[PDB]
Amino acid sequence: DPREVILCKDQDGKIGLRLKSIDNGIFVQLVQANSPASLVGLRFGDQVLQINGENCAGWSSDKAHKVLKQAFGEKITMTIRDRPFERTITMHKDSTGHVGFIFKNGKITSIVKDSSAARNGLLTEHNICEINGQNVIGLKDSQIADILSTSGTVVTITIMPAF
C-alpha cells in the first residue's frame, strides 16, 4: 500500500531530492542530508506514484524536476511506494576478513568463490544502498571500502538492481 507524505520546501524553494525516470515510473535517486525529503523518510529507490495527486507514470526526469519547481505554495504532497526493489542480505566475514565481493562506482561487479557473498546469493550489477544501517548512496568508493573494511564480522547490505 502506498503512503502519503507532505514535504515543506526550504528557504531556497528546494526539497533536497533528485528524481529519475525508470521503467516509466519515477524513483527517488538522491536524498540530501537533513532535507525536507529526508525529514519525511524518503530514500533512494522509493517509487513516487503521484505528485500533488498527479500520476507520475511516463514522466521524464526533466518533467518531474519541473513539476517540483512549479508546485504552488510551500508544501508538496507525494504518494510513495517504499523501495519496491530492496533486497537486504546478511553476510559474515571469514576468519581472515572478507565477505567476498568487488565493487566499483557503488555497484557490485564480482562475487568471490566459496565466500559469504557467494553463500548468501549476493548479485552483481546491483547498487549498494546501505551497509549496517548506514546510507552509502552518494559516497565515494573509497568511503564505501572503508566502511566495509572497518565493519564487524556481520555485514548486512541492502542492494537494488542497477537500472
Partner: peptide, 4 residues
C-alpha cells in the same frame, strides 16, 4: 576496487 580490491576484494571486500
Amino acid at each position: 576496487d580490491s576484494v571486500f
